[PDB]
């Protein structure tokens, strides 16, 4: 029983739906997440919708409020779970 | 005496109501929380309303802005308190 | 000279007014805070308006976005300052 | 070239303008900041518009979302930079 | 397939577009970012649109919600990636 059932889910709102992501590498994600909760620290590579990609030296349990289209598997050493 | 009494409580707003959660395991929570304050670090498993679940390797005092329907007891080693 | 003087102060907005809290124990706070900045790490107990209370094993300098009515003195080892 | 040029700058919005603060001690700040980025960890004292002041045992790189009128120099050991 | 495609991207919203920044030093950035994700810890210098600049002793993986016009190369030891 949620008292916030009638409330709309914005981008700023907490994570309603979560799904673990795989480093898919040139196949885009099913749904692009609002944020990424990292499970294991390391490096992971992220691509925008505009196509430019950088490597993120991420830590262990950080949330990073980025909205990626595709996570590639070349430099990805870090496992994450998407939030949406 | 709150000066913010007339203000509406959104999802982005601070925690008005808190209740400790138990790892219920196939019985859903009474009220689903806006966020989870973790008490003791460890692992805990969380299920959405869509049913998919992942394990979260959470730390000690982190808040995680996820909105879970049910916390299962299979892989839950971490005690948390819900915020709503 | 604030350029944000005409802006309304919501719950999501930064801390305008701060006051140090004492673990009052069955006398409610003067004004309930939007958030609590902790000064010294430890444990502290917090009561809602609905009456249920839990112990929070809080760390040293964390802010916790909870909106408590009364901070009791039974299990409170941690000093905090309220934000409003 | 900002794509967010037409957007209004709220209190919740990121830091547009930054200026380093000095512990002025009974002369108020030029502009009161939305938040304080701390440069060097230590203690610093902050006064509201209502006049009450507390000491904050702050850490090194923390941002603290407080909106102070004057930073005094009595107990201030920590250097910070204001955000607005 | 984003379910938040129709939603507008505010300043408070997560990072849609990311690009790595270079310490350009008296040539302004192409697009000013909403936030800066730091890659390697150190010091970096940031200039507003009003022109005043300070040095930030930043840590390794921190996001700092500042909106800089130009990152100079005099005191910049830290590599960052912009978010927008």
């Amino acid at each position: 029983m949620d008292v916030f059932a009638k409330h709309a889910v914005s981008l700023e709102s907490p994570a309603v739906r979560h799904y673990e992501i795989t480093p898919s590498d040139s196949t885009d994600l099913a749904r692009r997440p609002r944020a990424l909760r990292v499970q294991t620290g390391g490096t992971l590579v992220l691509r925008d919708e505009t196509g430019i990609t950088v490597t993120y030296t991420v830590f262990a349990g950080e949330i990073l409020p980025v909205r990626p289209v595709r996570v590639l598997a070349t430099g990805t050493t870090a496992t994450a779970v998407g939030w949406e | 005496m709150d000066v913010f009494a007339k203000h509406a409580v959104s999802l982005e707003s601070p925690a008005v109501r808190h209740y400790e959660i138990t790892p219920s395991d196939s019985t859903d929570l009474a009220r689903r929380p806006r966020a989870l304050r973790v008490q003791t670090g460890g692992t805990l498993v969380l299920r959405d309303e869509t049913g998919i679940t992942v394990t979260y390797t959470v730390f000690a005092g982190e808040i995680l802005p996820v909105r879970p329907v049910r916390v299962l007891a299979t892989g839950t080693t971490a005690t948390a308190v819900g915020w709503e | 000279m604030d350029v944000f003087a005409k802006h309304a102060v919501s719950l999501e907005s930064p801390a305008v007014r701060h006051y140090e809290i004492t673990p009052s124990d069955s006398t409610d706070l003067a004004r309930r805070p939007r958030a609590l900045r902790v000064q010294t790490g430890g444990t502290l107990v917090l009561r809602d308006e609905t009456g249920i209370t839990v112990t929070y094993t809080v760390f040293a300098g964390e802010i916790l976005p909870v909106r408590p009515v009364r901070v009791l003195a039974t299990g409170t080892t941690a000093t905090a300052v309220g934000w409003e | 070239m900002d794509v967010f040029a037409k957007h209004a700058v709220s209190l919740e919005s990121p830091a547009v303008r930054h200026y380093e603060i000095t512990p002025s001690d009974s002369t108020d700040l030029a502009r009161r900041p939305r938040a304080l980025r701390v440069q060097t960890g230590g203690t610093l004292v902050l006064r509201d518009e209502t006049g009450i002041t507390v000491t904050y045992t702050v850490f090194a790189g923390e941002i603290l979302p407080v909106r102070p009128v004057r930073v005094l120099a009595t107990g201030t050991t920590a250097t910070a930079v204001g955000w607005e | 397939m984003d379910v938040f495609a129709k939603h507008a991207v505010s300043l408070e919203s997560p990072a849609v577009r990311h690009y790595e920044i270079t310490p350009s030093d008296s040539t302004d950035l192409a697009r000013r970012p909403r936030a800066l994700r730091v890659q390697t810890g150190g010091t970096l210098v940031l200039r507003d649109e009003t022109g005043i600049t300070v040095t930030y002793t930043v840590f390794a993986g921190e996001i700092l919600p500042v909106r800089p016009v130009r990152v100079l190369a005099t005191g910049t030891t830290a590599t960052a990636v912009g978010w927008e």
């Binding site: 981008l11 | 808040i63 802005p65 | 999501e12 976005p65 | 939305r34 979302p65 | -």
Partner: peptide, 10 residues
Amino acid sequence: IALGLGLGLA
């Protein structure tokens, strides 16, 4: 920046 619980940028 401020006191929300929101997974957000600022």
